[PDB]
Amino acid sequence: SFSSLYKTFFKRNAVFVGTIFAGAFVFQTVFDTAITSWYENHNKGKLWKDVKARIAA
Amino acid sequence: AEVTQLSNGIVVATEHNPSAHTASVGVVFGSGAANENPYNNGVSNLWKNIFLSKENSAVAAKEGLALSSNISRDFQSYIVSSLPGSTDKSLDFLNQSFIQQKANLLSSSNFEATKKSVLKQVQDFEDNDHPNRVLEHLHSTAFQNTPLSLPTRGTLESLENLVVADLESFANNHFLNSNAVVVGTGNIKHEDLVNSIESKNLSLQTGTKPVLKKKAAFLGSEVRLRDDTLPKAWISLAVEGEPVNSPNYFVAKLAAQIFGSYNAFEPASRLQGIKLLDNIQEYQLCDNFNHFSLSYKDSGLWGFSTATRNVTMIDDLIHFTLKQWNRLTISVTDTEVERAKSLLKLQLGQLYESGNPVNDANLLGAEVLIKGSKLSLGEAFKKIDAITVKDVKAWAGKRLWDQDIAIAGTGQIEGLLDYMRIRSDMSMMRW
């Protein structure tokens, strides 16, 4: 949070109810992106996907 | 015919009226109760009150003179009023008082009879003149720790701590020529005064400038003087306004004009074409109000002032009003603006065109100090009218909407709400 980098977009008013919901909509994909990645990695080798890999039938 | 302005060392200004029965002369020092300091406060109102002590005022009473005096914030004046023919009878009595005499008014029997009356003076004011009292503190908190803060008539504190050695400490610094202007108002010519002025010699402390301080500033704040023994409730509120000689000087005076000034008693007032009035009147939320755009050299105060015997419902009072103020940014009717432009003019008139010379003095003296000259009514009007709605919607858009305020008050103000409410009503929720 820096007074320049904020005031650029929003001058001297808060966020606006709809811009919020917009961010919310975006954040919600961007997040479930990151976190589901970091977690699938942290558990590398362990996932059935990684085990489906080696194992053959 | 267009106001005269010529300087030979002493900047001599005059303004003629051919239908005036009398006239007036005097000086205006371009330094007022905001050139003082924390502990010398009221020095400028102390100077005014010796100047009218029976001594000097009995002198000019045989002569047929009457003296006028006032102190403001940015400025300070000393005026004398008489018949237009006794125009030398003025100039000489002025000359005596401000270069000739010094300790004739500065007696230890004079000064301890003036200071023992500017003490009773500032002890009926803060005691029983709440509307100005409230109005005065409003400056104290909005402009806290800065020039404008000091009450013009000075604190009873720094007013019992001051001797004659202090009247002078301010005199010999700020009572100069390069900070003053001589005025001629009413029924006299420019070639009557500036002649009778270059007739007299001498020069007091030539080359000397008066001194300076940290330029004033503004900060959102409150100060509350609750008093549940006082039958009403007095409140004054405002934002960082606009200075004298600011691009929006008139834009801002037009805004004030819109909501204006109420008196719940005069049936005339009840009918004004003011939107806010629709609300306030339902339950009789107050006894009166009025707005303003006080302009000073460095900073200003746009807001309003109200008294009310209605204690349980003050919270709406402040609410309806500050919401109206939002419209000025988002939804002001053009046809409201015209009624403004219109009414501004009528008010700005009785201000400038009153048949009383003493006013035309301070007006002249102050303005011809700060910008050099005066501005004509036709000049003012030519500006007032240029003003669109967009004028008012961009001025409120910076000055009014979501900006820090400055409340002050006394009486039954338990009902007057808090700062995160009040301040928050500067805006409205948007999608």
Ligand SMILES: CCCCCCCCCCCO[C@@H]1O[C@H](CO)[C@@H](O[C@H]2O[C@H](CO)[C@@H](O)[C@H](O)[C@H]2O)[C@H](O)[C@H]1O
């Ligand atoms: C129970 C489930 C709840 C779900 C989540 C709720 C999310 C709420 C989001 C609401 C955002 O609502 C938003 O509030 C801000 C104040 O911060 C408002 O801002 C308003 O007041 C601010 C001052 O605070 C002013 O700067 C501004 O000019 C004005 O529009 C704005 O009109 C609105 O757009």
